[PDB]
Amino acid sequence: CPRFLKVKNWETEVVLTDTLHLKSTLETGCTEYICMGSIMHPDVATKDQLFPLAKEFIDQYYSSIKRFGSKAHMERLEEVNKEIDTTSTYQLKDTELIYGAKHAWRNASRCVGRIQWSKLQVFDARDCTTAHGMFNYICNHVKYATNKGNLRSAITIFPQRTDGKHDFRVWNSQLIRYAGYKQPDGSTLGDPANVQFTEICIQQGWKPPRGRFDVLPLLLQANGNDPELFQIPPELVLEVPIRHPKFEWFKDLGLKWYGLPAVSNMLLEIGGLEFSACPFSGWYMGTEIGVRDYCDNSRYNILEEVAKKMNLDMRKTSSLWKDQALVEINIAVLYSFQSDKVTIVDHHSATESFIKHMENEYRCRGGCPADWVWIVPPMSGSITPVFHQEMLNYRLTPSFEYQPDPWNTHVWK
Amino acid sequence: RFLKVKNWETEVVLTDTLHLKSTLETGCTEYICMGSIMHPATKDQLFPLAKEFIDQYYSSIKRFGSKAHMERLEEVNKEIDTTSTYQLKDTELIYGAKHAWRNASRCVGRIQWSKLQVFDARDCTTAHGMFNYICNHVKYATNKGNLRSAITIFPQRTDGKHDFRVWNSQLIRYAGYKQPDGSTLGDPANVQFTEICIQQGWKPPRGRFDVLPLLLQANGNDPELFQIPPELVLEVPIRHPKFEWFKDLGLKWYGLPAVSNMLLEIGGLEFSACPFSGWYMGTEIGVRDYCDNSRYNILEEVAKKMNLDMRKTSSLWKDQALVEINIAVLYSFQSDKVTIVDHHSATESFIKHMENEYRCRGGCPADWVWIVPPMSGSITPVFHQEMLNYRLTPSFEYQPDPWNTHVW
Numbered sequence: 084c085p086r087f088l089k090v091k092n093w094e095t096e097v098v099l100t101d102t103l104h105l106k107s108t109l110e111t112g113c114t115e116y117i118c119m120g121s122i123m124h125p126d127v128a129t130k131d132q133l134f135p136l137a138k139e140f141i142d143q144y145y146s147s148i149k150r151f152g153s154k155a156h157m158e159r160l161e162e163v164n165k166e167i168d169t170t171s172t173y174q175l176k177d178t179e180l181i182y183g184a185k186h187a188w189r190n191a192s193r194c195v196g197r198i199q200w201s202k203l204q205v206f207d208a209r210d211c212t213t214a215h216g217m218f219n220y221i222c223n224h225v226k227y228a229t230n231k232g233n234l235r236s237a238i239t240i241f242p243q244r245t246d247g248k249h250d251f252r253v254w255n256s257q258l259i260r261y262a263g264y265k266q267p268d269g270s271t272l273g274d275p276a277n278v279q280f281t282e283i284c285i286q287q288g289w290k291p292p293r294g295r296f297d298v299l300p301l302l303l304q305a306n307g308n309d310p311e312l313f314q315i316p317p318e319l320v321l322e323v324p325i326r327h328p329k330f331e332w333f334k335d336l337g338l339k340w341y342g343l344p345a346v347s348n349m350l351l352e353i354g355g356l357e358f359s360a361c362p363f364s365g366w367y368m369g370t371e372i373g374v375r376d377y378c379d380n381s382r383y384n385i386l387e388e389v390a391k392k393m394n395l396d397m398r399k400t401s402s403l404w405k406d407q408a409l410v411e412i413n414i415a416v417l418y419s420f421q422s423d424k425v426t427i428v429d430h431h432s433a434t435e436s437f438i439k440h441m442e443n444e445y446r447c448r449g450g451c452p453a454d455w456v457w458i459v460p461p462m463s464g465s466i467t468p469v470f471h472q473e474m475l476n477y478r479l480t481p482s483f484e485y486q487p488d489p490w491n492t493h494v495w496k
Numbered sequence: 497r498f499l500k501v502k503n504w505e506t507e508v509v510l511t512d513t514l515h516l517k518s519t520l521e522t523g524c525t526e527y528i529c530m531g532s533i534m535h536p537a538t539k540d541q542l543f544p545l546a547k548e549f550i551d552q553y554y555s556s557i558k559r560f561g562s563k564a565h566m567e568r569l570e571e572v573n574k575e576i577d578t579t580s581t582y583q584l585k586d587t588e589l590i591y592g593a594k595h596a597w598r599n600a601s602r603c604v605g606r607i608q609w610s611k612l613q614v615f616d617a618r619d620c621t622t623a624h625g626m627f628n629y630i631c632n633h634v635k636y637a638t639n640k641g642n643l644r645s646a647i648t649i650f651p652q653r654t655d656g657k658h659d660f661r662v663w664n665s666q667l668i669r670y671a672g673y674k675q676p677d678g679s680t681l682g683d684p685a686n687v688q689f690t691e692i693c694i695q696q697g698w699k700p701p702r703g704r705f706d707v708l709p710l711l712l713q714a715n716g717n718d719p720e721l722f723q724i725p726p727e728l729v730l731e732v733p734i735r736h737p738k739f740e741w742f743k744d745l746g747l748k749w750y751g752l753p754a755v756s757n758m759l760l761e762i763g764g765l766e767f768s769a770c771p772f773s774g775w776y777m778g779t780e781i782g783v784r785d786y787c788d789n790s791r792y793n794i795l796e797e798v799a800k801k802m803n804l805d806m807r808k809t810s811s812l813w814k815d816q817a818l819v820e821i822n823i824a825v826l827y828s829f830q831s832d833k834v835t836i837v838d839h840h841s842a843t844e845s846f847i848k849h850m851e852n853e854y855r856c857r858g859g860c861p862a863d864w865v866w867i868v869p870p871m872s873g874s875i876t877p878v879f880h881q882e883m884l885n886y887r888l889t890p891s892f893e894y895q896p897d898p899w900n901t902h903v904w
């Protein structure tokens with residue numbers, strides 16, 4: 084592989100040089116003959132697999148703190164090595180855990196919000212042993228991150244995988260989601276994306292309100308045991324009613340959303356150690372809600388209804404009635420969050436910040452892995468600066484990875 | 497292996513076998529994806545390439561290994577042998593050109609691929625000849641508003657020193673002028689080319705929408721200037737169906753999108769001059785041409801006239817202005833009965849096309865970065881469609897700009 088790869092920005096002519104790609108640790112899915120750049124998704128580590136992975140990570144940590152080759156570096160290497168030999172695994176120091184989490188984010192090629200990577204509150208929950216304990220840790224996470232609307236990015240890290248039969252998992256794909264209910268007539272109530280998970284909760288004992296915006300309970304698995312249900316205290320769930328600055332009728336749509344985006348189904352990989360339960364949260368970019376959650380056809384799908392109230396000609400697509408309603412819906416989402424003083428960022432500000440971040444990373448780090456297909460917002464793409472920005476995509480470690488859904492793998496006791 | 501692609505909105509899963517045919521590179525490796533990078537012979541090289549192309553041509557007409565097939569292979573052999581090149585049969589030329597279009601990963605318009613008028617211009621020898629052939633192309637393809645896809649193919653490359661080149665990047669473009677006060681009149685993308693035309697003898701009217709002259713290079717010679725007769729150049733004044741002040745912006749655009757800077761490769765032969773044209777998708781003009789910061793850059797003005805609050809980005813004033821502009825463009829072309837497709841209709845057609853190709857062909861190479869429109873991405877069906885990208889031949893390839901390689 085070449086040492087220096089160049090990316091160009093076509094709007095500004097700015098050319099950047101990437102050397103960091105050389106540290107790439109896993110597969111993209113692409114080959115020389117085929118590109119899988121738009122493919123969404125393209126029993127434990129042995130002693131011998133673990134050694135080099137740990138050393139790689141420890142070396143990187145001590146390099147970051149300007150102590151590479153130091154006595155403490157060599158000592159930590161030797162202590163880690165001894166531990167893998169005696170126990171087949173090892174434990175990260177708090178400093179290393181914190182470093183690894185921040186770097187997993189920094190390395191997340193699909194995230195446009197990475198300018199904030201070094202400000203991340205890490206909660207060490209590796210002493211957790213039960214589902215009730217997971218509940219307590221998650222509630223504290225939610226409260227801290229929510230911060231009455233002045234959101235703060237955070238991650239809570241539960242115990243690493245051991246033999247694979249004692250995994251900690253948050254079964255919820257996200258900490259806060261709204262229920263979806265399939266009706267006998269084929270229609271769906273609530274969020275159609277969440278029908279399967281909702282059914283699981285119901286089966287596990289949940290009493291469903293059967294509303295349009297019912298916050299789902301937490302379904303929590305500790306130490307490989309069967310998962311348990313807990314209801315997040317409603318006062319910990321900050322919500323924003325959606326209204327529009329011009330259209331007084333917009334509030335009559337009965338829309339709202341939750342303030343806190345918190346992914347809970349991913350796996351955090353640090354130095355070959357696997358943290359299967361590591362819920363992390365930041366704050367929303369407007370389009371996430373205004374374009375995808377609200378306007379995807381398989382989601383709340385409100386374009387028609389909004390178009391109707393806007394008195395739009397909806398007979399020809401070439402009227403762009405869909406596009407027109409989309410913009411207004413996204414204005415309403417930003418207006419409502421700002422008015423309730425809940426942190427949110429529009430797609431213009433976020434993408435501009437990301438370009439600045441990316442340039443800084445090329446400068447200090449020799450590159451910045453980025454997935455253009457995900458970085459470019461789902462509306463108004465080319466009027467954001469990321470559209471014109473060539474990106475290189477590659478996988479650095481530590482990283483957040485996908486993992487199978489726990490109800491597909493769980494061995495019920 | 498076989499490969500699956502999922503549409504996440506419909507949950508439809510298609511299976512790609514066609515990719516096993518590719519041999520050219522994508523640019524990516526197992527460790528680095530370059531999917532968002534815009535730009536990532538001899539007798540012994542020539543025959544296997546010729547062979548494969550002839551092989552797939554005869555296979556496409558259900559006469560593989562036929563007598564005609566054999567003789568053709570034999571024929572191509574002797575010719576590469578004796579002349580260091582070979583000439584395509586007419587049928588092969590048309591097949592090759594349609595398939596270059598069909599294989600263009602970046603084109604959302606491929607549902608039309610087999611409806612392509614092919615003009616054989618391989619007997620051309622001079623820039624005057626090229627001009628004549630290009631004027632006929634434009635006249636035919638424009639067709640008084642009812643646009644028709646067409647391609648004009650000039651003589652292939654031989655020694656690299658006698659190249660035919662259309663120096664314009666597209667047949668019809670507006671000039672751009674670098675003002676004293678540092679701003680730009682017209683189209684800033686064309687500033688450099690406009691200046692080469694001026695230097696070569698072109699007398700610029702210095703307006704905002706001056707149709708550039710043709711600059712044509714035949715057989716490696718110096719390029720010569722020609723003015724396309726204006727009655728061949730169909731234009732549309734942009735107005736809005738509700739905002740009667742929109743026409744006052746004084747905007748127009750041309751009806752014929754016609755790429756003229758690409759290289760058509762067929763069976764190892766290189767056609768360095770192959771202007772091809774279709775019809776516009778509205779966003780091309782409404783979003784990119786007009787609203788790119790480095791293009792006509794009109795968002796700010798439109799935003800003013802719409803009396804929008806422009807102090808905070810979060811008012812989405814830019815997005816609002818963008819939608820209205822694209823409405824105007826569509827409305828204008830339609831009102832003038834000039835062929836145009838909106839990005840909703842175009843992306844639908846493309847999904848249907850994809851399904852057709854998977855069914856009859858075993859796949860369809862597609863570049864999501866180019867296919868997804870530059871506005872309202874996820875409300876179009878291609879946003880939710882996983883695509884595989886790979887390079888099939890015959891193909892359209894990029895080539896160097898001629899002013900960087902030509903000796904006068």
Ligand code: HEM
Nearest residue numbers: 188191193194195196199236237363364365366367368483
């Ligand atoms: C602080 C403000 C943040 C903003 C504005 C932000 C923005 C975004 C957006 C818009 C996406 C695409 C989401 C989607 O389309 O589903 C995304 C994805 C992602 N973000 Fe960030 N994010 C933030 C914080 C974080 C944090 C704190 C982490 C981890 C510690 C993180 C890691 C990721 C990862 C791994 C993805 C890919 C998710 C997936 O593949 O499903 N982000 N982010």
Ligand code: HEM
Nearest residue numbers: 597600602603604605608645647772773774775776777892
């Ligand atoms: C008939 C209606 C057509 C439509 C609606 C259409 C639409 C488009 C659009 C929107 C693009 C993106 C262009 C850009 O952003 O610069 C594109 C690219 C492209 N099209 Fe089509 N097209 C059509 C016809 C054709 C024809 C007739 C050919 C060839 C014979 C062709 C070959 C290509 C190629 C090679 C590209 C990639 C160009 C590049 O990489 O710069 N298209 N098309």
Ligand SMILES: CNCCCc1cc(F)cc(CCc2cc(C)cc(N)n2)c1
Nearest residue numbers: 257260344345346363364365366367368
């Ligand atoms: C195929 N994707 C399916 C999941 C989409 C999703 C749903 C959700 F409720 C919440 C999210 C959160 C995404 C996110 C995560 C973070 C940390 C910040 C931010 N602004 N956005 C995603």
Ligand SMILES: CNCCCc1cc(F)cc(CCc2cc(C)cc(N)n2)c1
Nearest residue numbers: 666669753754755772773774775776777
């Ligand atoms: C980075 N790209 C730079 C060139 C952009 C461009 C300029 C132009 F005048 C005309 C086009 C036409 C593209 C096209 C070509 C065809 C054949 C059909 C269609 N609807 N659109 C593109």
Ligand SMILES: C[C@H](O)[C@H](O)[C@H]1CNc2nc(N)[nH]c(=O)c2N1
Nearest residue numbers: 121122123456457879880881882
């Ligand atoms: C098929 C395609 O890869 C898929 O629809 C992707 C496109 N880009 C995306 N980008 C973001 N931010 N989020 C998504 O869910 C998707 N979905």
Ligand SMILES: C[C@H](O)[C@H](O)[C@H]1CNc2nc(N)[nH]c(=O)c2N1
Nearest residue numbers: 470471472473532533534865866
């Ligand atoms: C950096 C990126 O590759 C570049 O801006 C691409 C993105 N997608 C595009 N898509 C189309 N249709 N046309 C373009 O010019 C571009 N530009």
Ligand SMILES: [Zn+2]
Nearest residue numbers: 113118524529
């Ligand atoms: Zn790739």
